[model samples]
Target chain A: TPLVSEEELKLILAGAEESGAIQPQEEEMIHSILELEETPVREIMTPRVEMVAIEDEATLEDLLALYREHRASRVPVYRESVDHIVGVAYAKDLLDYYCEEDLKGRTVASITHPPYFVPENMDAWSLLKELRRRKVHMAIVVDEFGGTAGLVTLEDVIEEIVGEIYDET
Target chain B: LVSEEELKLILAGAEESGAIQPQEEEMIHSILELEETPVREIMTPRVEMVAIEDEATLEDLLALYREHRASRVPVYRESVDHIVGVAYAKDLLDYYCEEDLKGRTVASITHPPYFVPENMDAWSLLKELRRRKVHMAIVVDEFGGTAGLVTLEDVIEEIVGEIYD
Candidate 1:
């Protein structure tokens, strides 16, 4: 059998809705999933200004404080400015070390992990696949100038398909 | 389409670059299988539900809300299988500090429960939930009896991993 075109499938979905074979909400969701390929990363990414990042020079104390305040598991660590993001600091890694000396002497950069980078205008679906294929949960969205545009999480891409998932009450 | 083992191998090869965490691998595996899984598989069983009676008073509802700390709860008439609507925590804010809000029933403030069949796949149910702006839905079995309930957060968690508070 010949494959149906995207437009044909959409028409069939509409017809199904008209016939009451499926709910309007179901049709809307099917359309959203189809549109995921066309939706750009920049549209859904958390903007640079609102992103929680720590400076490379920040001490473990500063990192711990920020983690507690934001309740974020993964935070980008930058050098000098937000645009020069170097690595990600995972709260999960914090448990490995924590003597008073380690907290006072070590900088956030010491524990920062290399970040995955992607262009802002890339399709979210493709990015999601890339993240999955690479086994990464976060991607640093960058502009052509190699400066930070924002960041996207595996959760953000999944939200396009599953809706928002809140962690806090 | 690549097999799960093949995908795991590919992920393993790329893990050296610090891309995929083991937990994320499990999450990706779940997302790949989500379309084939039924809503009932991920639903919170009825026995574990934090529900209120349709005739429950505003004070009674408030106490349940505080105890459960749930964003949304099902409202039933006598039996849980007879769920009439879903109540949101935000909906109660209007009655906050209302001294005369006595005798108000939960039914008065409840929104219609979004319903789905127990056999409905998670992928489609997830989309419908999002499109309807519904946080929770009552899942009915083949006999149209309440099977359980699925939350928007649960479906998303299946794909993106758990959300820790």
Candidate 2:
């Protein structure tokens, strides 16, 4: 079957409203669903200037401290510079070693998985699929020269669709 | 009757009243205006769906799991439209750890799958998906045949804009 046209959808929403099947709130949310694809990674990514990342040489303790300082659920692990991203470190993963003195020396490199990367031009819809496919929550946006331009997280992507999902605590 | 522009005006006033933030108003604006997009415009087509048969072996399902890195996959009986349920990777691991895999089938570990119509509004489906706590839904056509699929993430992308994630 062919895709429903926007005009047709508008009628459905209007009809739904008339039938009292949807309220103003739901109608607003539906409109947001229509605006998603045209949005790009650059629009939602936290610019490199604001991204808090850890050096690969950092220890689990250092990473834990960083996580505490930032509300971001996942932090990018990098080598030398942001351009050389290794992988992302989840705040949840700290549960395994937060009290283990024996494992405090574990480096970010050891705890990180391969970082997911995306071009600045990629659409949010496409990136969301890639994130699910890679089982990764964070992705680094790279410039044309393969340099770090910004960072994006699953939450950041979610926020775009659902609106500020979380606030600074 | 209040027009869409009047709704935007009312929201803007609500923002000024400190009931909603300016950023939230932007979302509300997009939301009000985008109510008309059909699901087909944004749904993942069947060809791209990562599916498995109910009679499929656990090993084969695991292979599919690794290749797709998906936590949940739809399970079908005879065809895609005959989707019986969904399989969770965690359930697979739990079974793998507690029992032998010799004769385990994908259907044995599968949970019920959610279904939606392809012609439905993306926004309506998104809210339903959230309320259901299921991230994805199998898109079916008028004849109750599988048309495609949609995810919570996909519906979200429409509202919040794009991110690299």
Candidate 3:
């Protein structure tokens, strides 16, 4: 048999909250998860205007600043235009790959983590689960027309409930 | 505003022009397939199973792990039929330098094996696999001794189209 789904779970937890079995904030978190399950990622997404990314053709050294400024844990790497975001580069990858003597003229694309795209309409909770399962930190959001639209970081998706996750106090 | 046909044409052009990587496109196809596919349909069974013996040395285990690049391997007593436990490469680090091989064998460090029937849905397996925190599941046959195994890495890579073909 399949695991207990959110549909039944919400009902069961709803009963628990009616009594004194679970705390209000504790019950609140589960409701947030179910709420996000139906919410569109497009609504939660950090839209294109604010998405911190770098050109794929930029100098390898240029990447150091993206992390230095504390813009993002992972930065998107685009080719030609932001609409064609092709990959993502992590701040950790920058330190691990190292800017050694042999690699002077290489581009950011060299160490970029190949990117994946998810439809903008995908539910936020579903997207969060996929990111957790794959251990990926972020995914690029795409429109129905196939153009890049926004970025969904683990922080962005989890934050919806994590405000539910972090502090309601 | 544009006509519906013009909108459709423009939409098609954007899709055609967008830089969806070939692999990303393949991944989108497979995520739907995840529901329809059964374990038997896609379960790996090349007879090229990279397993180990319970009696084998860490050196042998290490050698095989390095050669096959195994994250985890099935441990059998005599042959693949008698799989005793599962061993992960992470457990072998203590012996990396040069361990006294006399008393040390893979079984000591092995953990209980996770077995699944060949008929289990591949999609449902993902749910069970994550809930239990198992990286691989040993797919066993009803009458047959052992069938094949699926790596957590393989499933995640395909489900999301992150890595591998």
Candidate 4:
């Protein structure tokens, strides 16, 4: 019929508090993180389209240009769609092929390694551990619908702890 | 109230490190403030940091390390503030101990610096730090300048206190 009164909640809390068993402040911060935990990945993820990437068929020259634009050391390679993520290319890979002028024959797929991808709703801490084990700088975020939601970098997670990512000039 | 387990952990670490002795109430307030305070609130400004230049000599780096007693330091180009990498004191010592000292550059030993923005939350940061396997992160300002630094211990201290489990 009627809802439980606030006084009853206080009494319950008081019981816990007086027992010297439960802490109020430590509980406070822990709860805050717990509260944000329920939010969707889309809320925290960088959108799919704006993600800097190269096509699997992108020539060496084209790939270098994209690298110049994004200032990113790593870029994902796809086959016309984000869902078909092929691999990731490292800028260092270009150093081996830099002197070749007629690089039109070079495809990104040949030089790239498979990219790591994770579910959108994946736990933050778990994601961090996975990244560490894999030694990767970025992971693709996949939504429940089985489509790419966005990309998250190691820096992205670092930002959550120490602050946000700033754009480089 | 503080968990007996956490209190014991802090005490042990304090015994080993001799940094600070924490009280229970301080732990509680830290827990409360950690979630509310962005990483920016507690970071040491970049200007105050003692970092290494990519081209700096081992002697030069060793001098700074001794002065700061820091485990790791960020490496950068002299004219460019953007960080090139990080070098651990142990790593430097390992390489320089038996080698020719003068021409050896910091870049040879420097690893990439882990970074995050100042507006980030403690929860996310904990996860990020866990994932990156990095204990320290450089905080950046909105304008792209260096802001402050956050460490894994800082996050732990924020929630559990200096004496927490």
Candidate 5:
């Protein structure tokens, strides 16, 4: 409890904000991190119903269309159903085969990257570190039944402090 | 030079006046010095990295995960230098309770590995990691050999100070 005692930090930020030393936004960022220290991942994630994903067996053209429509840089690839999410597909990784003639064998799975699956009840702060550690922006959260609970991302976590972050695609 | 010295003077005076704590004063000083610290100095050497084989069985993966208690581990092909992907412990949930885990491979659930140089300074590395939206970087030696591993938390401490837990 000695290293600035997290409790003291709140007051320091408040004091700094009042004295015009630090911006109100900067003050909120620190407070947001402390607030989410023990919060659940489920509380901050985008529900499965809103997840923008593709089928593992779908053609690259299909994924391209999904990306063009959804504008998500990365999309989850599922097997058979959303409950069986197998991997993630980065929109940029399809550059190699996007215009090639050997399109017959190139499916979303060919260029899919592995996704991080986390428990819904996991601590948001812990997931935040893992997301930063892995360079992964988002993770798929599984419910008690092994079904997709939702998805948590770097932006989702950050939005807790600075408010919602999104680009109109 | 004057500004850096002036900033420290202000922080120290604040702590003395019971405005901010001593730890805060020290933290401000540390954040200012991040530019001079090389990431390799703070990185865990390659030998310390907890990694797994790409072809390992799901059962073995689960066993290894529980034994090491690592939430994320790199997946190497033949050797660490040939790291193919990084796997997450939670990824096993979908297959853990299934009766067919015996035939599955850990490689199927791994994300691509992100690599970086060891000599990069902590300040730029943190900015690059954020700009790129990455969590961990496999620090590679000059000759392209595996040197060690560094995570966002490793660099975050250099800026935000440490968390006891």
Candidate 6:
């Protein structure tokens, strides 16, 4: 009636243990076949200083060049530093909004929206829900310092569910 | 203007000439399409969010988590359209240890929820949350309405993050 023998189970457990698949901290917590409980947002968020953003005053020509240099699909539009982010700029937005005749010196401020914010203690699941419910792709990770510490996105959550993730530019 | 083989030849030269070799550039181009994609494009559609009303009891909340196979469940008020905050199964376990059974309101443990405009940029949103030390955000539509939600992982996955693979 048993699908797995004790010896086989022990071998499987041993393999998992050898690879540190199970953590000592999770000994009492129930494990599930469908759900993978992730850590708090802070544990996975990309540090803010490491984030790349563009100045609002940057010209479209410069922005285009910056996109090429970063090889990124989007860039946060800021007034000055990471802490003063005002909006986000997507490569498509540039392609869509660029006025072929007048785009050489346009500022990013014309297109960016206010950035989204979320609490650090929040975990991955709730964060994923909010992103979907609101149709927003990214949410900023804030700290007690009230300064940008890291970043996360709706795409990030789906990748957690589906295995395939790729750098988008 | 160029044939496929010709293009590959040109790409090979360009790749080799670059200071940083082109890697995943093609995939990046496709995945970046998500920027224009609504959260619904990747979210667990209508039946996905694990929601429990504010009046929901512990028994009801637990059942929701189990049924949805979710670790974190959103707590709503009146209906799913009026989400208040979130409840993680792990957080509930901790709460159960400190509180009496059937003695808690969803509001008692609900976190202060944050929301963002639907069109908000994914990268900027992450930065804002980082500064605020918050992880989850409820996304709203163009009407300043609650359209869907996004998480720290959703944005990070588009680029890079550790995976089991």
Candidate 2 all-Cα RMSD? 11.5
Stretches of candidate 4 exceeding 4 Å from the true structure: A1-36, A99-105, B1-165
Model 6, span A1-169: residue lDDT tens? 2244323433443344345543221111111101323456776666786667789988766676676566555677777688876777765455433332355657777767678888787887667656655634778888877877678776555545433333421
Off by over 4 Å in 2: A1-111, A114-153, A156-169, B8-29, B97-99
Model 5 chain B poorest 10 in a row by lDDT: B1-10
True contacts kept of 2: 0.04
| Tens digits of per-residue lDDT for model 5, B17-118 | 665545445545555466678889888898898888999977777777656766678888999887887786645544433454577888888877778888
Error of 4 at B127 (Å): 19
DockQ of each: 0.04, 0.04, 0.02, 0.08, 0.03, 0.01
Segments of candidate 5 deviating more than 4 angstroms: A1-5, A102-104, A161-169, B1-165
Model 2, residue A105: C-alpha shift (Å): 18
Q: Which candidate is the best by DockQ?
A: 4
Per-candidate TM equals 0.54, 0.53, 0.45, 0.45, 0.51, 0.41
Clashing pairs in 1: A135-B19, A135-B20, A136-B19
TM-score of chain A of each: 0.87, 0.83, 0.79, 0.70, 0.84, 0.72
Q: What's the residue-level lDDT of B109 in candidate 6? A: 67
Per-model CA lDDT versus the true structure: 0.72, 0.70, 0.65, 0.62, 0.70, 0.56
lDDT of 6 at B133: 61
Best candidate (score: lDDT): 1
lDDT of 6 by residue, B56-91 (tens): 776566555555656556677777777788765534
In candidate 1, how many clashes are counted? 3
Worst 10 residues of 3 chain B by lDDT: B2-11
**Scored by Cα lDDT, where does model 4 land?**
0.62
CAPRI rating of model 2? incorrect
Pairs clashing in candidate 5?
Answer: A132-B135, A133-B135, A133-B136, A134-B135, A135-B134, A135-B135
True contacts kept of 1: 0.01
